[PDB]
Write a protein that binds this ligand. Structure first.
Ligand SMILES: C=CC[S@](=O)C[C@H](N)C(=O)O
Lengths: 374, 376
């Protein structure tokens, strides 16, 4: 069921008012949230007082149990609260680097990684496009660490290309972080949408030593489409780094999350297991359906196959500018996507689309892509 | 009617496990939130998607309307900045408008986050302590002017003043702006809407175009309507150059606006709940009257200064000549009540306590029976 999202103050569906537009840019799904979550949220409103709230007594076990998803054994003492992964990227920047020290990213990558480093020096190690996918340039990556890299921002799974890194990839990158003592911030916000042939490998799960150097940021906000509820869990095994993170959160006046962030994250992590099994097969089939429609009906585009709900498509054979592509997609396509040039080196002449939609919606998303470039 | 708040993850009621305790320490009310907030929140959940949301289309008019209807403050839509709470906004203000180890001034006895945010951000804590006279507080303007001569860059002002409850007159704020004009001002007006019949909240940036371009004004419905767990706050900054450097700091720390229900509750709070706020003012003041007399009549060994707004009561316990732990233990052991210690508010908080009178009179009379009982 396509659900009307116009008139809901949703950034995706309400920022543009021309009702002819199809929106597939912002990375939230157009699906009903799991009912267990909604039942807890309407249950909580039955108490008409919204004063200051504590984190629940049980919240530590629930998250430690959610080993159920990745067989990582954590302790309750590691969990830190954040209103979103973006503040935790900034706090991890300001905690573990000095001003004018460098921070490394692997484009094409989520732009906030670029903007938050507004605070530090840009170092890049763009990934290499191989075999209809992306791979890390480990020789070049270590060529950057030989210059003094202090922090690395890892995306796993990697937006926008959709890479779910293997254990061997992380180890050999882990082998370089140990060897050069690079601190790692692991933005694993998509850790819960993984396809049938892949398995998410938490970076700190690999080792006792990589655990003491990695800050792992997770949330149900993207997985369960509750990104307006602002729940995030940051796991820091190293006690000495955890306190410097929490100092950078305390002197900014952050004192924990709001009533609905606590309530939703508790239900999402306890009672929503079967809905997440469903959404994985619907999303994976939406990626499969889309990758063939580009074979049959748009042979001038190259789509990088994801392994974990965003689709990364090469539009380089078209020889179009971003201004040429954007205007065309809006005028005849009547569809709003993300321009890829803002993803950095390797995002040029690409677009990113949201496949977290009903297949009915996905067909018009592709029908208008064909019309645009036919 | 007292409403059960035990087992709700309330900091007030669930931090202590002794079920015999009566709690009046933290500054949230035990009152039903206005029903139109409950209706706005239940209306939103009928839409089962909580993705990323924009601030509402009308919220700028409502905010502009609210500040003119309550304070006759004509503001423009470009001045409104959103914050998840005033403690982040105080911290944001310290970071935008000072450099490290520069001086920021506060007036104790005052909200402790004014102490903690200044020092944790490696700025110099400067004070200009308030002076107790005739069971109210007045500013030591001679002392205040002395500290400004040392190069003070910032001042964090509380209006009205937690914990004492002072609602500054226009003459005082006129006199205080005159010294700031001879200092950047952060105005923590989170209590701006609970004011008693004989008093009027005087916005500092309302006084003049001269004080507007040097003042950052923090306001919220969180304390007024008891929705402080939803984290809605409104920052007004008329000076363009000051607004952008504040929003710059928010951006570098990943803030992109508030949560779905903070907008949803705040939008209703400023539109359809006006009569509920008339109710709560008259209930609070008579609760402040009832309390101030019971300690007049039946606890004559305590002197409480009369508040002119909000719902906190500032009470001196020095005639008892007890240390804080001497005093605290008696309240938790013998009183079976948790109140706010004063010593953590700074100079002039020694041997005082702060109690919450935002409760039904039923609770309020038992709160006082035990406070007498505690020290009899
Ligand atoms: C002991 C709690 C610290 S305090 O009660 C926090 C609240 N905003 C207030 O103004 O009181």
């Amino acid at each position: 069921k396509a659900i009307n999202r116009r008139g809901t103050h949703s950034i995706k569906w309400d920022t543009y008012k021309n009702e002819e537009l199809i929106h597939a840019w912002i990375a939230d799904m157009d699906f009903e949230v799991p009912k267990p979550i909604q039942t807890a949220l309407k249950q909580r409103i039955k108490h008409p007082i919204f004063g200051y709230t504590l984190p629940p007594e049980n919240i530590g076990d629930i998250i430690c149990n959610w080993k159920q998803q990745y067989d990582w054994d954590i302790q309750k003492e590691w969990i830190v609260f954040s209103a979103g992964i973006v503040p935790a990227l900034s706090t991890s920047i300001q905690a573990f680097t000095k001003e004018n020290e460098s921070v490394l990213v692997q484009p094409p990558i989520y732009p906030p990684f670029f903007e938050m480093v507004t605070n530090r020096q840009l170092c890049v190690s763009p990934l290499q496009k191989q075999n209809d996918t992306y791979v890390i340039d480990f020789k070049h990556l270590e060529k950057q660490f030989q210059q003094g890299i202090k922090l690395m921002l890892l995306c796993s799974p990697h937006n926008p290309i959709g890479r779910v890194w293997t254990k061997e990839e992380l180890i050999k990158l882990g082998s370089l972080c140990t060897k050069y003592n690079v601190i790692v911030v692991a933005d694993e916000i998509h850790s819960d949408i993984i396809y049938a042939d892949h398995t998410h490998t938490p970076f700190a799960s690999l080792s006792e030593e990589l655990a003491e150097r990695t800050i792992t940021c997770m949330a149900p906000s993207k997985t369960f489409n509750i990104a307006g509820l602002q729940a995030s869990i940051i796991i820091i095994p190293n006690e000495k780094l955890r306190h410097a993170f929490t100092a950078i959160q305390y002197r900014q006046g952050f004192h924990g999350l709001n009533i609905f962030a606590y309530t939703a994250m508790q239900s999402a992590y306890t009672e929503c297991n079967d809905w997440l099994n469903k959404i994985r097969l619907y999303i994976e089939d939406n990626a499969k359906f889309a990758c063939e429609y580009m074979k049959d009906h748009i042979p001038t585009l190259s789509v990088t196959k994801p392994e974990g709900f965003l689709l990364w498509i090469d539009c380089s054979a078209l020889n179009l500018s971003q201004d040429e592509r954007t205007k065309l997609l809006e005028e005849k396509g009547k569809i709003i996507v993300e321009p890829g040039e803002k993803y950095g080196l390797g995002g040029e002449e690409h677009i990113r689309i949201n496949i977290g939609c009903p297949r009915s919606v996905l067909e018009e998303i592709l029908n208008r892509l064909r019309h645009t470039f036919s």
